[PDB]
Design a protein around this ligand. Sequence first.
Ligand SMILES: COc1cc2c(cc1OC)[C@@H]1CC(=O)[C@H](CC(C)C)CN1CC2
Length: 734
Amino acid sequence: VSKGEELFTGVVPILVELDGDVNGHKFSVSGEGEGDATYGKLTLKLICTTGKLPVPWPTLVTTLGYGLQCFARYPDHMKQHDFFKSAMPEGYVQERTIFFKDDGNYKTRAEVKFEGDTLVNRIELKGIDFKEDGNILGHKLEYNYNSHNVYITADKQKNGIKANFKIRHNIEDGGVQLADHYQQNTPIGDGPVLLPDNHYLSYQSKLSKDPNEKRDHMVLLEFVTAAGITTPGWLSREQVFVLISAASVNLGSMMCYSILGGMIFGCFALFELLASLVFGNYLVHIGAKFMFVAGMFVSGGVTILFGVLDRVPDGPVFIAMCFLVRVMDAVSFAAAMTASSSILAKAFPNNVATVLGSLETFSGLGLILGPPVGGFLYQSFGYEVPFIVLGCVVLLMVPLNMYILPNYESDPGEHSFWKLIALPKVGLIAFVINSLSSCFGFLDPTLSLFVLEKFNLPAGYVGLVFLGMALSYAISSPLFGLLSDKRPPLRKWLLVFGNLITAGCYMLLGPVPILHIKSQLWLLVLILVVSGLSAGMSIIPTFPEILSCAHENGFEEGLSTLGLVSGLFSAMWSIGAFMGPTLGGFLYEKIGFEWAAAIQGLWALISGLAMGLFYLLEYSQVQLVESGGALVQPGGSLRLSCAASGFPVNRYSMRWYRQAPGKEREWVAGMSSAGDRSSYEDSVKGRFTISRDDARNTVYLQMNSLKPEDTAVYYCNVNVGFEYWGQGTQVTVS
Ligand SMILES: COc1cc2c(cc1OC)[C@@H]1CC(=O)[C@H](CC(C)C)CN1CC2
């Protein structure tokens, strides 16, 4: 960790100038924009002042967009290898030599300095031996750009770094143009710079235009990450810190709710919805740590003051005290839930479902700890006593959470609440979770009445079967959390099937007089256990799906979006808990439990079918799938098929790539937009044939007159703004 790391904790306004010559034609370009090193984001708007560019803009993307490598996000084992922020309070120099294949050369000198607030980059360019009928001077490069890798090794002799990479530009005729880049980077101002190990950076890029501008300009978007040296594999300090804290909080709150769980019941959810929405909307202004500790302090205060109601005289003071205890319990649980969910969403970015499943398992393992020590404290000390013993142990666990938790700081976002809530998929998520919470709230009060009226057992076995259903939920939560984490497209399927199995469970809850099924005990207990498993298999994949839809819509990453999605999760669980018991009790007094369970299960079933119909109707995502790999004797003939998913083939160009073992990727052939022009390598010239078919949205490559040289893995390449690849097929010849 260096001193210049602290400078890049925010947004940086950046300014770029270039002056260069190409065969006597001189140009000067100037640009402005922003950078963000927390996530690796660069956005520039770049305008010429001299006039027309005889050279294409993708030739200058590698000079201006790669000219600011200081906004690279490094993971926690790569902060030791940061060089760019090490010398940034004074500045560095970067010299680059670019060899275009079968054409001339660029040589650039650039200096990147930090003047005032702004970051300044000055570039001088020299261009040597360009043909007039070439891809560069003839304006033959497509107006999009590809994703790349940049490899950096160290250099002790100049205390700097040296990087090598290649850039594949697309030409309009179908082919590609290769540009090989060699750069050397050196500090100027004697700063303690970190000479790194061998590593590399991955660049995603995007290129567009501002439509209101009528000059010559480019809008450039850069995503950067860094890798190359593998992790130790075990956790960090902050992650074990937040796991111990969240586990202890979840244990304490669960056992507090288990040991002591109309106007006040509904106004409780009425304040709970508002508290969840307000805490979701304003979280960075309060902070995750402060709101964690505040929610735990108010929760412990509530469970201390719950014993005092026996010494409060009956009258207006009893109402004015129980009301305040009810609303403080509501806002304390809301604040603690949203704070814990947001901080664990930030702490584990890729493994978000596994942590939530593990905390659900610890909540179950803590609620099964209630009866023995609870009976010890009840028939050993008394009844006023166990609540204040619980309050003492929670208020002694609180300063640990004051000591341990890190200080995450962020800035307010660019969008609002109302843009997030207006998505269709999010509304269907909310409707599914309303069905689940309403089924749970209906299952609360009438089960004890049904057991007492039919089977003649008291509330002890009602609590026992509640324990069994919670245990099935606790077992089924982390496994399907791990399954939803590891496989992305199975997550939405587990969302649909969970609600469908839950609906089947609530229809088997009440034996329908049409269906002729008899009532007994172990069948009922088993259906409740399977209902717990279905609820667990549904509820865990909800939060990552809302996160994926939020990042897919275009919300900027940070803590604002995590806070909003956690607040919406708590809000939907609040409005479901509200809607559930009132409709369940109304249906129980009106028509009976037997049809009430059927109507509730049918509600859940139509919720799941609406979800499944939205998935069956409006799904589309860019994908390339391939087929045609086998083993053929030399001199044979083959056909390879690349089937696309979510773009028109007749409006975009297509490329075919190949790779040999122990060798880099090589371009084979390319097919343009209009379908009349094709491009080939001389090793596949006259032999390989490319074809398309826009009716079935598929492209094909046919081969004849085989050689042992063409044993390779073949790939299919598009660019629809981003670069998308395929999994490849193995083609072997003898
Ligand atoms: C009566 O309202 C409440 C109902 C419930 C809970 C808390 C309540 O408030 C005290 C807990 C909360 C979560 O930890 C768990 C449920 C999800 C919201 C993650 C476990 N459940 C049972 C339902």
